[PDB]
């Protein structure tokens, strides 16, 4: 979440990131419940106040909200104890932020994201962009290993594909920022633009990437002014599930049919409907590719036709249980590397050796009834020496 992203930052980057135009407001909106008011309170104070007052300024009931808010805002470093006055820079910027100092767009965003997902999947026809391809490859959801051949899809790719559009886009942008730092694009400058949206060379490239993702559209041959789409700031279902593992999806966009075929066997494709079967073969194929039953169940639930919404639960228990059981049947046997000594003789002497391999992290399984211990070959040169020392001690 954005709270996690901002918490994972240093004070030096934080105070700089607290830009005048929007950041002080975007980070304010994050404040879940109460930190809004206390910050507002001490927006006009130039004198720090004792911590005991803040501690006692919440009733005995619902105090956990007080501690959690205080910890969150301490991590954000909005104030300093100074002994709890807010940061002067944040105070000034917040005062400046508080009385101081479309139908085609959404369709465009939808179409651009749909073509992006088409390229993500093995679609023969898709938008071509080397920068987008390499960005997705380095995002960790795609690996090529051969420039001539089109890149394939990794295990994480299917999991990302089956996610809902909001979380999908949010995670994609999180990876975009993380890779922006790696490629050298300043993180603060690009981050501030996202906050400003909800109200330089690097800026131009970042805006180009956002437009490629479909969040923004200049509409004027790449002019300075931009009109963000709905997705920039941050629908009814169509699948009907039977009790015989049959899916009837009212899908016209090929993306939905591809997503369903990822974990189901397609039977018929009507102009406004498609019939598929959720069989062991398809489900286990998806599980081997990397998906887990949770993503499939969530996908079917979110894309649930209104007809089946009346019944509770929406997804039939038999279908859900069958999918879960199919995923569970996937793993049984294991693999590890180890070495076994034996003849530990004295009972109280074997108990001391068990703590040597457990602290170093080379112990797999033990046995106090037969005096047997398995030691991995990675730490064999350290356990033997200890045993020798013990023998010398006698």
């Amino acid at each position: 979440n954005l709270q996690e992203f901002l918490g994972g930052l240093s004070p030096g980057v934080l105070d700089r990131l607290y830009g005048h135009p929007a950041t002080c407001l975007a980070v304010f909106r994050e404040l879940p419940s109460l930190a809004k008011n206390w910050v507002m309170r001490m927006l006009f104070l130039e004198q720090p106040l004792p911590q005991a007052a803040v501690a006692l300024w919440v009733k005995k009931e619902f105090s956990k909200a007080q501690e959690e808010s205080t910890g969150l805002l301490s991590g954000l470093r909005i104030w300093h104890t100074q002994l709890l006055i807010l940061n002067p820079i944040f105070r000034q910027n917040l005062r400046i932020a508080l009385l101081g100092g479309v139908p085609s767009l959404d369709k465009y965003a939808e179409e651009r994201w749909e073509v992006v997902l088409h390229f993500m999947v093995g679609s023969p026809s898709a938008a071509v962009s080397q920068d987008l391809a390499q960005l997705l490859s380095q995002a960790g959801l795609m690996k090529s290993t051969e420039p001539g051949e089109p890149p394939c899809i990794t295990s994480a790719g299917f999991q990302f594909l089956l996610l809902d559009t909001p979380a999908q886009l949010w995670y994609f942008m999180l990876q975009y920022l993380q890779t922006a730092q790696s490629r050298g694009m300043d993180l603060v400058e690009i981050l501030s633009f996202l906050f400003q949206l909800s109200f330089s060379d690097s800026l131009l490239n970042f805006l180009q990437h956002l437009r490629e993702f479909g969040l923004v559209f200049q509409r004027k041959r790449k002019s300075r002014r931009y009109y963000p789409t709905r997705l920039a700031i941050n629908q009814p279902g169509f699948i009907v599930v039977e009790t015989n593992y049959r899916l009837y999806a009212y899908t016209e966009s090929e993306l939905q049919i591809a997503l369903i075929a990822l974990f189901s066997e397609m039977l018929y494709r009507f102009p406004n409907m498609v019939v598929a079967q959720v069989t062991r073969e398809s489900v286990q194929q998806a599980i081997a590719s990397g998906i887990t039953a949770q993503q499939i169940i969530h996908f079917l639930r979110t894309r649930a036709h209104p007809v089946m919404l009346k019944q509770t639960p929406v997804l039939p228990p038999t279908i859900t249980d069958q999918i879960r059981l199919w995923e569970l049947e996937r793993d049984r046997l294991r693999f590890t590397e180890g070495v076994l000594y034996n003849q530990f003789l004295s009972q109280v002497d074997f108990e001391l050796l068990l703590a040597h391999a457990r602290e170093l992290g080379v112990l797999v399984f033990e046995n106090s009834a037969k005096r047997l211990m398995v030691v991995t070959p990675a730490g064999h040169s350290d356990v033997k020496r200890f045993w020798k020392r013990q023998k010398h001690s006698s």
């Binding site: 009790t243 066997e265 494709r269 009507f270 007809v307």
Partner: protein, 605 residues
């Protein structure tokens, strides 16, 4: 014919889509499969039309699945629906048009009907036809000449070869007409049989009878109705309407007894006028007309007793107005089907509740008796309350370690006796029976293996019925189960599913299964469908448990067996573990008890 990148029969270029597709709730695949919507406002009309012209294969709650064939179209024409009368409305209802393949199939099937008619008169079967060209071009193959005994053109045909000629015509594309004009028939005088006002006919029974009675003429066909729906009442009503000599054929002693009881209960016909042509007991079969007998006796191939021989000769000599056959799914068997030719009847009505089998001999029923006039909707009956709602469940029992060890180690088929008897499921059935016994729920345990049934029954000191089980003892046990409060459970063998008059039971446990057979599964499930006096659909008063053993062929058998029920719509809930089993004291808990049971199983040989 076109396959998408997936197992997808592609039809984008096959048929178009109607603009008012939302208004039209009907689909038509080129193969003949039709998918109806159960949520559309015109669902009732669409259901009636599709039931008229097609036979259901899967009717879940939301989207029903039908498929039409030559026999279904012939039945539609018999009830009088012309090619246009069906196709015009099919196109109107269809939201995506009608493929040319289905159009030509419907046209051909409808036109190829009524040209050849089979009428039996004076013990002679004449193949009448108003059109002579049909016979002229039908006498090409020599089988017809060798078959024949050595406008409105008709010729006599041999009695024995009727089945062969009929199955030949079915693929020759000239189906025979078996309509009985009982309204206009003076050769055989009408029998003095009437339907008393006491009998009450349910709406689905009336609909099936209406499909059966297209006109004044009684049509010979098969009516599929749930066992709890009152198929016995429907058959009694059919006989009463026919008002002529009726021969009902059961499948066992229980079936014949129940049929006689139903006759007496629902028909004013006197007791003396009904006979039981049964070896165990007889009531002067030659004396009276209305008769109830069995396939085994009529088709008996070995030496016949003197009295049975006289009765059989009398039956063969006489002509029957109606031939009722219950549990028609067994008819295509060799001996059972021989009875059809052994006995003479104008119309042979067929009644059953599970018209399904693995071997492709069910299609033979279409000519052995006639087209399937009706199939009752089990889900609709459940909603209407005519049949008790059942909470179908499959309790998964993990197999005990040792038992699994021997089961997997041995490649022989002692596994049938092994996995049927394991501590986890033996404790399960005992605990389930205890829980229902303290809940005052009537239990009907089922098990294919008589050996396992006897072992369980002796260990639980319960009255198992099976194999020889004398008829007197069988009736005594059933009476005790129905009346005596102290006993509320009966352990029936495979004989139970064949044809049983049994009291409504609140639960039905099945410890063992004969195989992955949808006939036995549905037959046993039908026992608890008997609607109670004042129950409710949502209360789920009726329960069905199909105990299975984990990691065994029984799992495969159970999955290969619940297909028909899931197609109807029943959701089989899986139960990995049962609450309270650990606290409740049951046998085979400690390792030692499982060890002695395993030793006994091994010594069973």
């Amino acid at each position: 014919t076109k396959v998408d990148e997936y197992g997808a029969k592609d039809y984008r270029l096959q048929m178009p889509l109607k603009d008012d597709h939302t208004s039209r709730p009907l689909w038509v695949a080129p193969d003949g499969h039709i998918f109806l919507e159960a949520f559309s406002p015109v669902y009732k009309y669409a259901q009636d039309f599709l039931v008229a012209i097609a036979e259901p294969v899967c009717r879940p709650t939301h989207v029903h699945e039908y498929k039409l064939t030559a026999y279904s179209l012939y039945a539609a024409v018999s009830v009088g629906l012309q090619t246009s009368d069906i196709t015009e409305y099919l196109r109107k209802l269809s939201k995506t048009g009608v493929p040319d393949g289905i159009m030509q199939f419907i046209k051909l099937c409808t036109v190829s009907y009524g040209k050849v008619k089979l009428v039996l008169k004076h013990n002679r079967y004449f193949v009448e036809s108003c059109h002579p060209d049909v016979i002229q071009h039908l006498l090409q193959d020599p089988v017809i000449r060798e078959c024949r005994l050595r406008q409105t053109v008709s010729f006599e045909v041999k009695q024995e070869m009727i089945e062969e000629l009929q199955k030949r015509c079915i693929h020759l594309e000239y189906p025979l007409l078996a309509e009985y004009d009982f309204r206009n028939d003076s050769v055989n005088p009408d029998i003095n049989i009437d339907l008393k006002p006491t009998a009450v006919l349910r709406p689905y029974q009336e609909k099936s009878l209406r499909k059966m009675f297209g006109n004044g003429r009684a049509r010979s066909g098969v009516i599929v109705l749930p066992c709890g729906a009152g198929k016995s009442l429907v058959g009694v009503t059919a006989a009463c309407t026919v008002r002529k000599r009726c021969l009902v054929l059961g499948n066992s002693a229980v079936s014949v007894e129940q049929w006689k009881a139903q006759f007496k209960m629902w028909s004013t016909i006197d007791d003396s006028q009904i006979c039981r042509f049964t070896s165990d007991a007889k009531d002067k079969p030659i004396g009276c007309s209305v008769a109830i007998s069995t396939y085994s006796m009529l088709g008996h191939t070995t030496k016949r007793s003197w009295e049975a021989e006289r009765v059989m000769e009398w039956l063969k000599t006489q002509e029957w107005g109606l031939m009722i056959l219950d549990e028609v799914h067994t008819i295509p068997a060799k001996m059972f089907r021989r009875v059809l030719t052994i006995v003479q009847a104008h119309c042979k009505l067929g009644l059953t509740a599970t018209l399904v089998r693995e071997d492709d001999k069910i299609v033979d029923l279409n000519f052995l008796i006639g087209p399937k006039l009706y199939e009752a909707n089990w889900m609709e009956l459940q909603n209407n309350g005519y049949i008790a709602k059942v909470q179908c469940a499959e309790v998964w029992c993990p197999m005990s370690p040792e038992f699994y060890r021997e089961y997997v180690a041995i490649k022989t088929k002692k596994r049938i006796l092994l996995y049927t008897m394991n501590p986890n499921k033996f404790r399960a059935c005992q605990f389930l029976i205890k829980f229902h016994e303290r809940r005052n729920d009537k239990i009907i345990v089922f098990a294919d293996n008589v050996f396992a049934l006897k072992e369980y029954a002796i260990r639980l000191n319960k009255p198992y019925i099976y194999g020889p089980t004398s008829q007197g003892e069988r009736m005594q046990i059933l009476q005790n189960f129905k009346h005596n409060p102290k006993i509320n459970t009966i352990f029936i063998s495979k004989v139970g599913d064949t044809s049983f008059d049994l009291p409504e039971a609140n639960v039905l446990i099945q410890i063992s299964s004969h195989g992955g057979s949808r006939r036995q599964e549905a037959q046993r499930l039908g026992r608890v469908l008997r609607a109670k006096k004042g129950m409710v659909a949502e209360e789920y008063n009726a329960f069905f448990y199909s105990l299975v053993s984990q990691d065994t062929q029984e799992m495969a058998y159970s999955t290969k067996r619940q297909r028909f029920l899931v197609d109807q719509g029943y959701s089989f809930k899986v139960i990995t573990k049962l609450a309270g089993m650990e606290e409740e004291d049951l046998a085979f808990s400690t390792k030692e008890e499982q060890q002695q049971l395993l030793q006994k199983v091994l010594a069973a040989t």
